[PDB]
Amino acid sequence: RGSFVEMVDNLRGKSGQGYYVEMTVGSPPQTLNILVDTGSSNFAVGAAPHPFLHRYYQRQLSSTYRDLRKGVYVPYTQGKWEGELGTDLVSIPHGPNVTVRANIAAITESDKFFINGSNWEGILGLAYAEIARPDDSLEPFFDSLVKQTHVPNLFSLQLCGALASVGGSMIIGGIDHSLYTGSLWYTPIRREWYYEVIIVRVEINGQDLKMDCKEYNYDKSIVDSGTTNLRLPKKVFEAAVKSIKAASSTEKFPDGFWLGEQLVCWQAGTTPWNIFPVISLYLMGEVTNQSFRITILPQQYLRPVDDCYKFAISQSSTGTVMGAVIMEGFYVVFDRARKRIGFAVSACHVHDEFRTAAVEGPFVTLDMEDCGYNIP
Ligand SMILES: Cn1cc([C@H]2C[C@H]3CSC(N)=N[C@@]3(c3ccc(F)cc3F)CO2)cn1
């Protein structure tokens, strides 16, 4: 359905600084680079001359700007942004040939939000209204896009990985079959807030972690393009590291490396990928008692920083976060229309002659509903 040439390679970025898409806001159009984030729900752009910014939204130059006369305050774990709500006309030059009236938070103050040295000036929150700030009445961009146009209620992301430049594709309103190999396998979206999914089993080199599956999703598991690492609940991180250390034991590394406090280096071109295990996440499938598994390589979880690397699996207190470490192995379809997320082997994933990332199924998995966490 099935080919979108003009949207292929519409994402850029720098290692660890996120993936961005070009957008225009206002009349006449003001071009801005916007970080693509499936982990949030606000469209928010710099609107004042912060030193780190290449450019910013100048509301005084737009005839289509409309003030909502309402502020928005967004503290989060690692920083904060605040702004003034309004609406304006928005387009995506390397996206669908449409213009929509969307909510825009004009960022007037922030802390640890913008990245010194990055090439983006705003964020595109692609998740659902439930988690939008200040509340669910502030319609997210994608919802406005689907309401105002005939663009189908789906988008897909191919994040390619390799400060080294990164690239990828955001296919808005469809799937591009050239971006993946094999078949797409779908997992249900548990609830429409974050893109919440259920992990039913975890294996390290095919060796099951043997944990109560509720631990894998404590307190949620999400698909997040705005996070670099694969983040795991503390207990799961503890078991995964123990197992990865055991499989990779032919070479010893300091405790700091596994905690991300130190790097590891090998003479350029000699990285011993073969000693590092593959990581498999089994996800809840579309049918009762049926699952599938996605498998990533050390090429996804050992990130380049003499070839030096950071261990990009880390502990979380906010549940599993399937960030770029997962997304870079796969073509990911956010099939909002059918409340499901599809995964297929990415045609751009980094691998070697011995192993490739994989999406396999079906598998028989019982009691999968018990894997989801519920607040008592
Ligand atoms: C629900 N909600 C998310 C939020 C925040 C969480 C942060 C960190 S993780 C992420 N995926 N996006 C954010 C984020 C991502 C990349 C970045 F360079 C700066 C950021 F702030 C934006 O939404 C606020 N409320």
Per-position DSSP letters for 193-225, written without gaps between them: TTBEE-EEEEEETTEE----GGGGGSS-EEE-T
User: 354 burial class (0-12, 13-18, 19+ CB within 10 angstroms)?
Assistant: exposed
CA–CA distances in Å: residue 26 to residues 82, 88, 197: 20, 6, 36
Distance CA 91, CA 257 (A): 43
Evaluate: CB of 91 within 6 angstroms of ligand 1. Answer: no
Distance CA 141, CA 147 (A): 10
* DSSP β-ladder status, 122-125 and 30-37: parallel
Buried b (16+ CB within 10 A) or exposed e, 303-339: bbeeeebbbbbbbbeebbbbbbbbbbbbbbbbbbeee
∠ CA 96-106-99, nearest 5°, is: 20
Query: Technique behind this structure?
Result: X-ray
Of 182, 118, 212, nearest in space to 347 by CA: 182
Distance CA 110, CA 78 (A): 11
Distance CA 4, CA 155 (A): 12
Rounded to the nearest whole angstrom, what is the distance from the C-alpha of residue 39 to the centroid of ligand 1? 6
Closest residue by Cα to atom 3, ligand 1, is 40
Distance CA 116, CA 79 (A): 14
Per-position DSSP letters for 47-66, written without gaps between them: -S--TT-S----GGG-TT-E
Evaluate: CB of 18 within 6 angstroms of ligand 1. Answer: yes
Residue entry with tokens 């050239």: 178
Of 173, 70, 194, nearest in space to 129 by CA: 194
Evaluate: CB of 40 within 6 angstroms of ligand 1. Answer: yes
Evaluate: CB of 121 within 6 angstroms of ligand 1. Answer: no
Rounded to the nearest whole angstrom, what is the distance from the C-alpha of residue 226 to the centroid of ligand 1? 6
Catalytic annotation, pick one of 37, 143, 176, 335: 37
Which domains, and CATH codes, for the chain? 19-151 (2.40.70.10), 152-376 (2.40.70.10)
**What is the signed CA dihedral for 119, 122, 123, 129, rounded to 10 degrees?**
-170
Distance CA 80, CA 2 (A): 39
Respond yes or no: is residue 224 known to be catalytic. yes
Closest residue by Cα to atom 2, ligand 1, is 40
Distance CA 35, CA 44 (A): 10
Distance CA 327, CA 160 (A): 9
Rounded to the nearest whole angstrom, what is the distance from the C-alpha of residue 105 to the centroid of ligand 1? 14
Evaluate: CB of 37 within 6 angstroms of ligand 1. Answer: yes
∠ CA 44-49-54, nearest 5°, is: 80
121 close to 85: Cβ distance less than 8 angstroms: no
Q: 354: which 2 tokens? A: 């011995």
Distance CA 49, CA 334 (A): 34
Count of C-beta atoms within a 10 Å radius of residue 348: 16
- Contacts of residue 373, defined as CB under 8 A and 6 or more positions apart, other chains included, come to 214, 217, 218, 219, 220, 319
Respond yes or no: is residue 37 known to be catalytic. yes
126 close to 141: Cβ distance less than 8 angstroms: yes
Per-position DSSP letters for 271-306, written without gaps between them: --GGGSPPEEEEEE-SSTTEEEEEEE-HHHHEEE--
Give the ligand 1 atom nearest the CA of 76. Answer: 24
Closest residue by Cα to atom 4, ligand 1, is 40
**Could you tell me which residues are beta bridge partners of residue 25?**
30, 90
Computed on alpha carbons and rounded to an integer, the radius of gyration of the chain in Å comes to: 21
302 close to 262: Cβ distance less than 8 angstroms: no
Evaluate: CB of 328 within 6 angstroms of ligand 1. Answer: no
Of 202, 161, 195, 174, nearest in space to 346 by CA: 161
Catalytic annotation, pick one of 136, 224, 335, 352: 224
Rounded to the nearest whole angstrom, what is the distance from the C-alpha of residue 130 to the centroid of ligand 1? 15
Of 307, 338, 341, nearest in space to 327 by CA: 341
User: 236 burial class (0-12, 13-18, 19+ CB within 10 angstroms)?
Assistant: buried
